[PDB]
């Protein structure tokens with residue numbers, strides 16, 4: 001079927017910079033003909049070529065094209081002028097999840113449950129297509145205008161074909177031990193991350209903290225962390241079935257028999273998994 005015109009820079013009115021990266025910048029832009037707002041990621045071809053990132057830029061584009069779910073930032077289009085690449089991304093009006101965590105300290109039982117259920121839901125979809133995020137964190141979990149989550153940042157993801165290959169290491173506090181002792185990663189890697197996130201929603205801080213990265217990696221492989229007193233019991237329990245050094249024993253992985261058991265965990269008792277994105281999120285305390 002024929003497609004709409006290939007878009008070009010002039011079709012937009014660029015506005016504020018939302019965020020600046022090492023090899024890119026996200027700029028909020030407004031499309032002239034439609035008046036729609038898109039968050040446009042811009043990258044300089046020369047810089048990318050100079051830094052051997054073609055693999056990372058191509059992957060991000062490819063992975064996102066394949067995605068088609070309400071909990072993932074959509075990639076509306078792409079185009080390029082002589083020196084730059086533009087990626088039309090959906091604009092999450094309420095920003096990073098982390099913002100909220102800092103704004104209110106920790107989440108209460110209901111808000112933790114709800115949002116954790118979306119992450120899980122989103123992870124089940126992703127893994128369903130044999131895709132590993134590899135750097136999941138509150139910074140990558142955005143919130144749309146309705147306060148529903150929207151995972152983004154897939155340039156460092158990985159597509160499976162065998163648990164497989166390797167490359168980089170995501171943010172320190174979310175790295176699973178297998179990456180520190182095996183230089184290899186699988187789906188559970190995202191599960192370990194999930195465990196960390198859940199723990200952070202409840203305690204206000206991630207499981208492994210230390211003066212530097214080398215120190216956090218030291219705690220990770222030794223599994224050094226502990227729960228705070230008021231930590232919701234069922235939540236605590238779920239987290240213990242997630243932060244397991246052995247990646248084949250994490251609740252939710254293939255060897256553990258998938259997402260059935262995970263969604264069936266007591267912590268999600270009252271969750272209705274079927275239409276999460278059509279439910280009204282609990283007001284963030």
Ligand SMILES: Cn1cc(C2=C(c3cn(CCCN)c4ccccc34)C(=O)NC2=O)c2ccccc21
Nearest residue numbers: 018019026039073089090091092095139140152153
């Ligand atoms: C308000 N906000 C939304 C951002 C958005 C996105 C974004 C957000 N991140 C990660 C968090 C950046 N702080 C990205 C990483 C790679 C590519 C895009 C993003 C996005 O995909 N849509 C957005 O609306 C964003 C990015 C950087 C800084 C602030 C941001």
